[PDB]
Amino acid sequence: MSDAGRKGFGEKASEALKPDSQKSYAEQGKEYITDKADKVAGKVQPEDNKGVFQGVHDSAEKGKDNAEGQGESLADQARDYMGAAKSKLNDAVEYVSGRVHGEEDPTKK
């Protein structure tokens, strides 16, 4: 009866040490009036569905059909979306132009 051994499991020393405190606070944005015009956005996602008793689910896709002008009837439909195209435009501008502050020098803030 001889020749044997036993290592086992465990550690040797390792190291962790203690922290050194930390700090992080005070933040804001301020922001202010931005520029106008842009025309950069433009895209669309896929979709598919048939036979449904609900509202809708679309905005604008790639192709050719939307918009119009000629006609003694479509004139009204256009005048309706027209007034809305204005208020909507300003909405998109404030967004794009608003992100310009990230790297610009506007007036006041």
Side-chain angles (χ1 to χ4, degrees):
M1 47 249 98
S2 75
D3 205 299
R6 234 140 87 76
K7 301 108 197 203
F9 59 87
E11 66 236 276
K12 53 185 109 157
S14 322
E15 246 204 60
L17 255 296
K18 270 206 199 147
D20 41 61
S21 237
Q22 51 240 54
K23 282 102 162 210
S24 232
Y25 63 89
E27 64 127 320
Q28 54 196 258
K30 245 123 145 99
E31 100 213 327
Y32 222 60
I33 302 301
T34 63
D35 315 326
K36 275 85 165 208
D38 257 295
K39 286 217 232 104
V40 289
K43 63 153 81 145
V44 65
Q45 257 145 304
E47 61 202 67
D48 53 84
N49 256 112
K50 74 93 90 81
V52 183
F53 194 63
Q54 227 153 77
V56 303
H57 201 167
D58 198 50
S59 194
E61 71 210 300
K62 255 98 262 285
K64 236 139 206 108
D65 234 275
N66 223 232
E68 240 243 35
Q70 272 200 112
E72 58 144 295
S73 208
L74 241 291
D76 230 273
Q77 311 188 0
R79 239 290 128 71
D80 217 82
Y81 217 59
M82 265 243 105
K86 314 296 283 110
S87 245
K88 267 240 209 154
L89 241 310
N90 221 262
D91 244 302
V93 192
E94 204 222 327
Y95 192 87
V96 191
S97 210
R99 214 208 170 178
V100 175
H101 276 206
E103 205 126 81
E104 214 242 88
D105 208 329
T107 62
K108 230 249 164 300
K109 249 224 215 205

